[PDB]
Amino acid sequence: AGAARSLSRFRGCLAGALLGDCVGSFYEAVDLTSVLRHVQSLETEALYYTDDTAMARALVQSLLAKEAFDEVDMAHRFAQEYKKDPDRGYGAGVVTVFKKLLNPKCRDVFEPARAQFNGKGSYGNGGAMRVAGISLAYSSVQDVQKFARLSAQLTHASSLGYNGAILQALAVHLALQGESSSEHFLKQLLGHMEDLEGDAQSVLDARELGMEERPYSSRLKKIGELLDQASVTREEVVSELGNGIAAFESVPTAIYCFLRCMEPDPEIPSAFNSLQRTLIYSISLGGATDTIATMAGAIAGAYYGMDQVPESWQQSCEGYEETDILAQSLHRVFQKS
Ligand SMILES: Nc1ncnc2c1ncn2[C@@H]1O[C@H](COP(=O)(O)OP(=O)(O)OC[C@H]2O[C@H](O)[C@H](O)[C@@H]2O)[C@@H](O)[C@H]1O
Ligand SMILES: [Mg+2]
């Protein structure tokens, strides 16, 4: 709500991400009718957050402590946050990275991520699940891309992983700018991803995994088709975009959820506002619901602002007040209000 990159959008962004994580986590690894029954419960801090929020908080606290990106600080905050509470539902592979980073002999904090999965790097969505803070801290598209990539590379060295983090950060960046058509929003994202996926390293990373050339671009083109298609079913969405833990099977899906739900949906009750129905729709897709909902929620919260964050939902979430203070701090320190 209000001006581009306003305090309301900053607070709404991080609150939306927390709601998606906490509420989404109920359904991780799902039918439209019975989701609507579950949010009835939310009509305090009983919903625990997961690794999505834990790593987002460490990322933001690194940015605030150094008033800049500092790979050693952030890498060590990721590792110490894991050491402090390892039971948040971290990916099975990424824990190896944290353990390597906990060794004081580790002098290049990017190298543990590069050894993952036979030296090809992770393409999991962990780099994207946490990246919204980057777009709160950085105004420029150039800086958003630069530090979404770097923050992700601390754990996700595959371009399939960090290009999902960039896409998700670009989406939040665009949402923080305010009102747009769904087609203009999508078109801008398509342009950026077409540019990034023209890079030789990206092409090789994708051909090695047997995927199409420009996987994110192809999925963003499918979003545009889906947005023009009649009677789109959840199975159709899952089949074309995915609902899994790969970044390329969850980040475009999160974006689709946001774009679709910019308009009312007769199949979800009018009493839910735009942020609420975006989260409800995301969870109804099943699969990796907490990360898809957390990412859709970050985009929607930045676009719709704090006035659409419902207190009853927010106050069910573990850490919601700290999440809010961190949002306000980013706005003070980086948006320099
Ligand atoms: N190159 C690869 N080859 C094969 N499998 C892979 C590869 N990369 C990832 N995977 C699979 O992807 C998995 C995750 O990769 P990880 O890097 O451990 O962690 P994350 O931070 O991305 O978290 C992944 C999500 O899952 C949880 O719900 C979290 O909350 C996240 O939402 C691996 O275990 C592999 O099965
Ligand atoms: Mg999680």
Residue numbers in the entry: 14 to 42, 46 to 59, 70 to 363
Give the published text.
In contrast, ARH3 has a unique ARH fold and a di-Mg2+-containing catalytic center and can efficiently reverse not only PARylation but also mono(ADP-ribosyl)ation (MARylation) at serine; ARH3 can also cleave O-acetyl-ADPR and α-NAD+ in a Mg2+-dependent manner releasing free ADPR. While coordination of two magnesium ions (MgA and MgB) significantly enhances its catalytic efficiency, calcium binding suppresses its function. In the active site of ARH3, acidic residues, including Asp77, Asp78, Asp314, and Asp316, maintain the integrity of the bimetallic center and render the ideal alignment of the substrate for catalysis.
Similarly, on the other side of the active site, Asp314 interacts with 3″-OH of the terminal ribose and MgB. Asp314 seems to contribute to the integrity of MgB, given that the substitution of Asp314 with glutamate eliminates MgB from the active site. In the structure of ARH3D314A, similar to ARH3D314E, MgB is missing. Unlike ARH3D77A, the orientation of ADPR in ARH3D314A is nearly identical to that in ARH3WT, and critical residues for the formation of the binuclear metal center occupy nearly identical positions. The geometry of MgA is also maintained in an octahedral shape as seen in ARH3WT. The 3″-OH group of the terminal ribose, which is originally in direct coordination with MgB and the side chain of Asp314, lacks interactions with the enzyme in the structure of ARH3D314A and is disordered. Consistent with these findings, ARH3D314A shows a 44-fold decrease in ADPR-binding affinity compared with ARH3WT. Notably, this reduced ADPR-binding affinity mimics the metal-free state of ARH3, further supporting the hypothesis that MgB is critical for substrate binding in ARH3. Among ARH3 mutants, only ARH3D314A showed some residual PAR hydrolysis activity in the presence of Mg2+, and the others were nearly inactive in all three tested metal conditions.
